[PDB]
Amino acid sequence: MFSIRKIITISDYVTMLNIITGLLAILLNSFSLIYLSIIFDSLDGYVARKTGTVSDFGAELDSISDVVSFGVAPAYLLYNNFESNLALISAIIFCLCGALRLARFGILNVKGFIGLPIPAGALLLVGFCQLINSYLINSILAILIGLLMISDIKYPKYPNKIFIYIFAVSLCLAIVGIPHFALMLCLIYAIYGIIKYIRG
Amino acid sequence: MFSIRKIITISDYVTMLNIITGLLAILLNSFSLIYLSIIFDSLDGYVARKTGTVSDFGAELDSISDVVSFGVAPAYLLYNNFESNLALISAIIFCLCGALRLARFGILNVKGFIGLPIPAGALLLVGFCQLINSYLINSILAILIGLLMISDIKYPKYPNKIFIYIFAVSLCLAIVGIPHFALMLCLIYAIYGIIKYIRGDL
Numbered sequence: 546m547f548s549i550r551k552i553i554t555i556s557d558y559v560t561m562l563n564i565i566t567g568l569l570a571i572l573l574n575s576f577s578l579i580y581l582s583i584i585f586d587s588l589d590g591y592v593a594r595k596t597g598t599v600s601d602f603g604a605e606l607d608s609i610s611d612v613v614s615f616g617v618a619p620a621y622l623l624y625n626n627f628e629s630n631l632a633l634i635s636a637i638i639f640c641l642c643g644a645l646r647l648a649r650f651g652i653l654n655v656k657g658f659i660g661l662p663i664p665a666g667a668l669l670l671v672g673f674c675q676l677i678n679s680y681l682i683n684s685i686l687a688i689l690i691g692l693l694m695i696s697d698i699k700y701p702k703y704p705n706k707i708f709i710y711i712f713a714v715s716l717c718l719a720i721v722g723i724p725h726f727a728l729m730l731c732l733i734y735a736i737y738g739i740i741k742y743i744r745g
Numbered sequence: 746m747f748s749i750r751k752i753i754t755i756s757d758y759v760t761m762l763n764i765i766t767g768l769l770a771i772l773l774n775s776f777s778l779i780y781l782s783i784i785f786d787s788l789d790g791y792v793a794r795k796t797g798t799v800s801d802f803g804a805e806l807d808s809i810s811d812v813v814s815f816g817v818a819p820a821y822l823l824y825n826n827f828e829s830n831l832a833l834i835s836a837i838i839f840c841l842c843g844a845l846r847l848a849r850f851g852i853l854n855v856k857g858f859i860g861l862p863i864p865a866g867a868l869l870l871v872g873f874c875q876l877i878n879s880y881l882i883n884s885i886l887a888i889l890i891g892l893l894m895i896s897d898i899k900y901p902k903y904p905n906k907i908f909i910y911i912f913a914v915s916l917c918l919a920i921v922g923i924p925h926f927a928l929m930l931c932l933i934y935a936i937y938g939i940i941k942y943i944r945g946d947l
């Protein structure tokens with residue numbers, strides 16, 4: 546008897562792949578698997594709305610996967626690959642800002658985002674932890690990226706299919722070892738949110 | 746810039762504390778911080794009802810803290826301290842069964858618990874990881890607990906002061922290195938559900 550098998554759907558199958566990849570990045574110390582987790586997290590919602598398998602269980606499961614993949618894993622990667630007392634303070638602040646902004650997203654039903662979304666925060670931190678070899682610098686970004694995440698800066702979701710693929714190609718290049726394009730499209734998407742907010 | 750400061754209550758800070766210790770358990774590779782997490786997870790609720798700060802922003806943050814403290818960390822503490830191709834396969838199944846039953850707990854407003862609760866499943870795996878020094882036994886227990894956590898075995902929630910006090914007393918003993926009493930309680934509480942699932946229906 547496992548009645549939980551009744552509410553599991555095809556979209557939840559992709560979400561569990563997103564959980565596995567996020568937890569595997571923690572266990573295997575892989576920055577690359579975080580890039581695979583962004584591909585999954587940007588797809589399972591599209592997969593849900595395509596097969597009609599949208600559910601509150603899948604929505605809750607969608608954010609549980611964000612916790613593992615884009616909240617704990619990037620904080621772990623930052624500390625495990627930059628062992629310091631500065632980085633430990635920053636990994637905590639980064640993870641707490643992820644939990645807080647995911648608790649806000651859980652009670653909201655808006656098209657866009659309130660504050661920088663947690664996948665864009667992970668891609669920034671992880672991509673910065675892959676290109677910069679600095680305990681001090683990467684710790685300041687994590688705190689900066691964290692404060693962006695619990696802010697009121699509105700960000701657009703526009704999950705139109707071409708936008709996902711364009712984002713995903715850079716993630717495919719990021720997985721194989723060139724995150725410069727994944728990081729370029731993220732820093733542009735980040736400051737774009739700033740300007741549209743400061744402009745009004 | 747931070748309208749999140751308006752919706753954060755005093756009980757949320759106890760949840761913020763449970764996130765810090767659960768994450769410090771992963772980073773510092775600490776079995777003891779999981780036991781301190783189970784105490785925090787028992788009180789952030791209690792504070793919320795006691796101080797009337799029950800909120801959907803706090804219920805969300807409550808589930809988020811369970812993933813870090815009792816989903817990822819027991820899986821990490823298992824694989825890290827028992828590195829093998831198999832503690833990897835079991836820690837994945839454990840953390841996956843935790844996410845499935847936490848996503849079900851979110852859609853359900855039932856009085857008790859459907860399946861073994863994730864703090865109890867974590868304590869069982871964590872307490873066993875401290876007592877049994879075997880890649881094999883701890884990997885199987887993760888399977889059995891994981892299957893228990895996604896099962897339909899109804900587990901009761903009786904969060905009164907006296908009950909929370911007894912469990913937290915043993916958890917303090919687990920914090921300082923004697924987890925045999927929180928382990929014995931969690932074994933009794935786990936099998937108690939299997940008996941009541943078997944003995945009666947309604």
Ligand SMILES: CCCCCCCC/C=C/CCCCCCCC(=O)OC[C@H](O)CO
Pocket residue numbers: 628629630633765769773
């Ligand atoms: C309001 C704030 C409340 C916050 C309350 C939570 C307190 C956080 C405790 C952290 C202890 C961390 C233990 C430090 C372990 C450091 C291990 C280490 O590696 O440091 C050595 C260095 O990296 C070699 O160069």
Ligand SMILES: CCCCCCCC/C=C/CCCCCCCC(=O)OC[C@H](O)CO
Pocket residue numbers: 630
């Ligand atoms: C309540 C939560 C806040 C945290 C409360 C604790 C405050 C931390 C104080 C540290 C100073 C202790 C004196 C040691 C000086 C720092 C040592 C150091 O900076 O590095 C270590 C050295 O490099 C070898 O690893």
Ligand SMILES: CCCCCCCC/C=C/CCCCCCCC(=O)OC[C@H](O)CO
Pocket residue numbers: 873875876877
């Ligand atoms: C229903 C069947 C499922 C449940 C069956 C599993 C329960 C069996 C008990 C296991 C713990 C016994 C541990 C025996 C050894 C403990 C003493 C010891 O060596 O501890 C090491 C030391 O504490 C290092 O810190």
Ligand SMILES: CCCCCCCC/C=C\CCCCCCCC(=O)OC[C@H](O)CO
Pocket residue numbers: 573574575576577578581626720721
């Ligand atoms: C898994 C992707 C599935 C899609 C297939 C696409 C091809 C790319 C495959 C593997 C990329 C390499 C993975 C990198 C694994 C490295 C593990 C690690 O330990 O990371 C070291 C890092 O440098 C910390 O310092």
Ligand SMILES: CCCCCCCC/C=C\CCCCCCCC(=O)OC[C@H](O)CO
Pocket residue numbers: 723725726
């Ligand atoms: C469009 C005409 C009007 C604007 C004209 C201005 C030129 C803008 C274009 C590029 C600027 C360079 C931006 C940074 C590009 C870095 C690309 C790179 O170096 O990637 C190498 C790869 O990562 C190996 O590992």
Ligand SMILES: CCCCCCCC/C=C\CCCCCCCC(=O)OC[C@H](O)CO
Pocket residue numbers: 876877878879882885886889
């Ligand atoms: C049904 C679940 C499948 C698993 C079966 C559960 C029942 C096994 C009970 C105890 C095993 C303890 C024996 C294995 C460990 C030796 C005892 C021990 O931990 O000693 C400490 C170690 O030698 C130094 O740290």
Ligand SMILES: [Ca+2]
Pocket residue numbers: 585586587588589590607
């Ligand atoms: Ca998603």
Ligand SMILES: [Ca+2]
Pocket residue numbers: 785786787788789790807
């Ligand atoms: Ca709680």
Ligand SMILES: [Cl-]
Pocket residue numbers: 646649650653657658659660
């Ligand atoms: Cl949001």
Ligand SMILES: [Cl-]
Pocket residue numbers: 611646647650662663664
């Ligand atoms: Cl988010």
Ligand SMILES: [Cl-]
Pocket residue numbers: 849850853857858859860
């Ligand atoms: Cl439940």
Ligand SMILES: [Cl-]
Pocket residue numbers: 846847850861862863864
């Ligand atoms: Cl639970």
Ligand SMILES: [Mg+2]
Pocket residue numbers: 560563586606607608609610611
């Ligand atoms: Mg997700």
Ligand SMILES: [Mg+2]
Pocket residue numbers: 763786806807808809810811812
């Ligand atoms: Mg919790």
Ligand code: NA
Pocket residue numbers: 554556557593598599600602603604
């Ligand atoms: Na779904």
Ligand code: NA
Pocket residue numbers: 753754755756757793798799800802803804
């Ligand atoms: Na609250």
